[PDB]
Design a protein around this ligand. Structure first.
Ligand SMILES: *CCC(=O)Nc1cc(Nc2nccc(-c3cn(C)c4ccccc34)n2)c(OCC(F)(F)F)nc1N(C)CCN(C)C
Length: 281
């Protein structure tokens, strides 16, 4: 027996939001930066506006409407025009992959380990909601402030095993298309590796079709220069063949929290008006 999903889908008036500029474009479509000004209440909310694809943006709106956690992106509503528009919280510092690349010379160990805690909290919450993300990656973690990140992009999420980006996927997902919370743990491991390498590309150069063979042979991603064996062992554990031998998200929270209390012991880095944010509306 499953519980009824009593989330609210808010439908917004087009005249309530002003597109300020284009943040980005691609196959997906066009994402704009804007404000949402609900009629009456004196409030201006910074928002991102994302303009069968309709069925897919609706599937994603369904998922984002059903999650509410400090480390998961919040859905504000949809607007029913020509194409369906997703209206989400504007995350001013962009995705975490671009952020660590753009600020390599300024990311301390405190930030890196705190991001690992926060991402783990967000994923643990998703697991509580019996939700498999299926696309966890540094590109899909947004930065509200350098101190606060949130998991985004639920275009592949599935509400529960469940029967694609190859270099972030567990071996079971590449071979048998099986996805669990524990295959999300594998993707968490690759995401942490991305952050610890300040944005390197996993298996850079290796063709995606070769990835399945490499993993079967026992090879894994290398140990990042800044990583003590303590941190790298955590990543390696996320890449075990036996899915139930990988750590749980609730455990990853615990481990990385301990490390975040003495960060320089685990990461060795050289030189180590009426505007309302959505979290307060
Ligand atoms: C990693 C790519 C990226 O994040 N670019 C980005 C994003 C924001 N803020 C933001 N907030 C909420 C939702 C989104 C978003 C959702 N989807 C599906 C996207 C696709 C492509 C780009 C963005 C999204 N993004 C951001 O905030 C800037 C500001 F607040 F001023 F609007 N800036 C950026 N950029 C442009 C920085 C990264 N570039 C180097 C690509």
């Amino acid at each position: 027996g499953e519980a009824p999903n009593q989330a609210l889908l808010r439908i917004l008036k087009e005249t309530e939001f002003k597109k300020i500029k284009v943040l980005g474009s691609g196959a997906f479509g066009t994402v704009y930066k804007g404000l949402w000004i609900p009629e009456g209440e004196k409030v201006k909310i910074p928002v991102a506006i994302k303009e069968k694809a309709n069925k897919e943006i609706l599937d994603e709106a369904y998922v984002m409407a059903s999650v509410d956690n400090p480390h998961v992106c919040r859905l504000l509503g949809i607007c029913l025009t020509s194409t369906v528009q997703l209206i989400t919280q504007l995350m001013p510092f962009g995705c975490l992959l671009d952020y660590v690349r753009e600020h390599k010379d300024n990311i301390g160990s405190q930030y890196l380990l705190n991001w690992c805690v926060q991402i783990a909290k967000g994923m643990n919450y998703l697991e509580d909601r019996r939700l498999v993300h299926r696309d966890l990656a540094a590109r899909n973690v947004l930065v509200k402030t350098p101190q606060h990140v949130k998991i985004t992009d639920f275009g592949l999420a599935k509400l529960l095993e469940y029967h694609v980006p190859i270099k972030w996927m567990a071996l079971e997902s590449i071979l048998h298309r099986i996805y669990t919370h524990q295959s999300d743990v594998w993707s968490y491991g690759v995401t942490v590796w991305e952050l610890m390498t300040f944005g390197s590309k996993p298996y850079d150069g290796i063709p995606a079709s070769e990835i399945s063979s490499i993993l079967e042979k026992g090879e894994r991603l290398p140990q990042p220069p800044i990583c003590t064996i303590d941190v790298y062992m955590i990543m390696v554990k996320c890449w075990m063949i036996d899915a139930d031998s990988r750590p749980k998200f609730r455990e990853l929270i615990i481990e990385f929290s301990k490390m975040a209390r003495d960060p320089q012991r685990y990461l060795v880095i050289q030189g180590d008006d009426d505007v309302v944010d959505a979290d307060e509306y």
